[PDB]
Chains A and B, each alone.
Chain A
Amino acid sequence: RFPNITNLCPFGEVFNATRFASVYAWNRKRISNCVADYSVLYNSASFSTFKCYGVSPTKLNDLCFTNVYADSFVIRGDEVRQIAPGQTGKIADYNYKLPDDFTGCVIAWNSNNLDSKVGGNYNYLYRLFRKSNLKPFERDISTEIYQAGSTPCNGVEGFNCYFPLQSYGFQPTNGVGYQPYRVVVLSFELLHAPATVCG
């Protein structure tokens, strides 16, 4: 009848962040040993997509989790669908892929107010092609030039010689499909260890 743990999960430190990471270099924050209130996140109510897998989001608040990881990145509006288990797309195949047995949540909200500027922001990149598909939660930030050509590239972008990463270029005048969206993916395991507490 008396509470032990006094630690708030630092969701603010992951959401009120100055600049999110590029989708090819998605940032991950280890969450542990803290209480979290998901009612405040859903009540913020600005998110365009707040969908959870393995557990209904409405009844998420009264469960105890372990190995909670928050992955943050920025993608295109039309690319939101790709952040889901088993989806095939430009991003999911080569940038960030949820596994088929996914257990976490996906949060996505429009960032056209901050992450685009007149003339465009080209600081958010995506990996166009990769030699092999990415494994779940695999993080590959390599910048090795494809040199399918006579001469060796020697680390110079050019012709017969292509660079993997492509700039997004969000302008505030873009279509909603091309507008930038900030995404946070929560990976966790459902824990039922104390029968009374987590039953």
Chain B
Amino acid sequence: XKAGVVYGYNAWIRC
């Protein structure tokens, strides 16, 4: 998703 927000690993999987 949106560039410029720090995703956590598991939330980056959901991304």
Contact = CB atoms under 8 A, between A and B. Distances in A.
Interface of A: 3-5, 9, 31-39, 60-66, 68, 188, 191, 193-194, 196-198
Nearest to B15: A197
8 contacts: A4-B1, A5-B15, A32-B5, A33-B6, A36-B7, A62-B11, A62-B14, A198-B11
Given A3-B13, A3-B15, A194 B1 contact: yes
Given A3-B13, A5-B15, A197-B15, A66 B8 contact: no
A9 B13 contact: no
Given A3-B15, A197-B15, A35 B1 contact: no
A-B pairs with the 8 shortest C-beta distances?
A62-B10, A37-B9, A35-B12, A68-B6, A64-B7, A64-B11, A65-B6, A197-B14
Interface size class of B (residues with CB under 8 A): 10 to 19
A61 to B, nearest CB: 5
Contacts of A9: 6
Interface of B: 1-15
Contacts of B10: 61-62
Contacts of A60: 8
B6 A34 contact: yes
Contacts of A32: 4-6
A81 B7 CA distance: 29
B9 to A, nearest CB: 4
A5 B13 CA distance: 10
Contact of B7 (A35, A39, A196): A35
B4 A36 contact: no
Given A3-B12, A3-B13, A64-B11, A36 B6 contact: yes
